[PDB]
């Protein structure tokens, strides 16, 4: 019988630079009248910086607007911001995914069974992980094959990439580097190697 239809006025995918301001805004039609409007992030509720009002004062109005002001975004403030609204009949939600530019972060690096090496990087944009082998006596060029795989917080608002190689092919004592980079920066984990 009743309904709520949320229309985003800005793209529900948001890319921003560290320190940027952005407004998450929606217009929605609801009947009967909405209630318990709230913006949620990390399962917590904004008690400020947000506004929610009817599009018109006409007594037959059913269009509403709600806006969340996000200011000076830090790299750690990306993630899913959800708008929840309900009336005496229906629940509706809409998720905005905010991604803030940050250099890759190496979350784990491991020695696997069967001689494989693995490092896991998170960041935005999506980190590219290159592997380099450096003998005792410059290094190599990024090596293949590689098992790359997109994992699915913390950290929130980041694309997480798992990259694995087989160290078996490599010969001689040295150091293996897994470099995670993107347009923002780069980072590296190192494995010491014995033959």
């Amino acid at each position: 019988k009743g309904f709520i239809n949320i229309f985003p006025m800005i793209n529900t995918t948001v890319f921003v630079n560290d320190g940027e301001n952005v407004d998450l805004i929606v217009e929605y039609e609801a009947f009967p009248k909405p209630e318990h409007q709230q913006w949620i992030y990390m399962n917590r509720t904004f008690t400020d910086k947000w506004e929610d009002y009817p599009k018109s004062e006409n007594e037959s109005n059913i269009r509403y607007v709600s806006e969340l002001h996000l200011t000076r975004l830090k790299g750690t403030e990306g993630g899913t911001y959800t708008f929840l609204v309900s009336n005496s009949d229906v629940n509706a939600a809409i998720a905005f995914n905010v991604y803030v530019n940050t250099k890759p972060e190496i979350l784990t690096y491991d020695r696997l069974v069967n001689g494989m090496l693995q490092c896991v990087a998170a960041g935005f944009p999506e980190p590219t992980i290159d592997w380099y082998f450096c003998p005792g006596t410059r290094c190599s060029a990024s090596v293949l094959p590689v098992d790359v795989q997109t994992l699915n917080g913390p950290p929130f608002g980041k694309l997480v990439v798992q990259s694995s190689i087989d160290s078996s092919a490599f010969k001689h004592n040295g150091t293996v580097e897994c470099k995670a980079y993107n347009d923002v920066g780069k980072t590296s984990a190192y494995f010491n190697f014995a033959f």
Epitope: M9, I10, N11, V14, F15, V16, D23, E27, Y53, T71
Partner: antibody, heavy 117, light 107 residues
Framework: EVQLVESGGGLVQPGGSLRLSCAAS????????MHWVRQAPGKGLEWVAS????????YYADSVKGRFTISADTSKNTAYLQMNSLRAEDTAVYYC??????????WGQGTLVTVSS | QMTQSPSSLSASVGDRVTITCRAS??????VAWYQQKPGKAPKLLIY???SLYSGVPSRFSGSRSGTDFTLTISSLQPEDFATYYC??????????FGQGTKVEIKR
């Protein structure tokens, strides 16, 4: 860095028609609202119109309502103001600006629209 | 509706100037202030009444009367010559600009 560049302005005959464009770089207009603001020679700022490029929603001042049309191309990252039935009183510098937190934080350098015979 | 004052003023270098803005009764916080140098696009100084926009020097601040919004420039600088605008956002009237206040630097 962020950059806004208006273009397509110039001398236009009373009743004539003109179309301004605003090319944005350094941000996605579909994550914001874009506005046109005009300033008549030696006068103050006057809000003209706005648009949410993602949804296509548009808004107009009464003085231009039904006579101007604001639009946007999310792939070219460019907003437009189509001006019709131009008059001497519409003569001004037109700026495009990015809207966030109720203010206009980034502005173009402006383009002069002169309405004259 | 919206009203700004004074329309024009003259101040010395090192002075402290205060520009008042009378916004609609419905608007509670949505007030911004711009600076416009001659032949240039306006620059955002303050938003949401008291928030200082990045890159803008501390000389500028936004405050209250209260009930009326105020722009304040302390230690006025020779480069502070310009026209200053307040602007409001309100639900039914959307974006409205103030008449402007031209600041001449007494010398």
């Amino acid at each position: 860095e962020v950059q806004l560049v208006e273009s397509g302005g110039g001398l236009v005959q009373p009743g004539g028609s003109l179309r301004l464009s605003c090319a944005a770089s350094g941000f996605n207009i579909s994550s914001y609202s874009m506005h046109w603001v005009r300033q008549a020679p030696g006068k103050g700022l006057e809000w003209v119109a706005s648009i949410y490029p993602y949804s296509g929603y548009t808004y107009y001042a009464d003085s231009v309502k039904g006579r101007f049309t604001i639009s946007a191309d999310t792939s070219k990252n460019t907003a437009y103001l189509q001006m019709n039935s131009l008059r001497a009183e519409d003569t001004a510098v037109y700026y495009c600006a990015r809207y966030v937190y109720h203010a206009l934080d980034y502005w173009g350098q402006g383009t002069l629209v002169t309405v004259s015979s | 509706q919206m009203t700004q004052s004074p329309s024009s003023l003259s101040a010395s270098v090192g002075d402290r100037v205060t520009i008042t803005c009378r916004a609609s009764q419905s608007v509670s916080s949505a007030v911004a202030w711009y600076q416009q140098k001659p032949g240039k696009a306006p620059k955002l100084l303050i938003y949401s009444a008291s928030s200082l926009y990045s890159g803008v020097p501390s000389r500028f601040s936004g405050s209250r009367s209260g009930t009326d919004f105020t722009l304040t420039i302390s230690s006025l600088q020779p480069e502070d010559f310009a026209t200053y605008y307040c602007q409001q956002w309100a639900v039914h009237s959307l974006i409205t600009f103030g008449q402007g206040t031209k600041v001449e630097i007494k010398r």
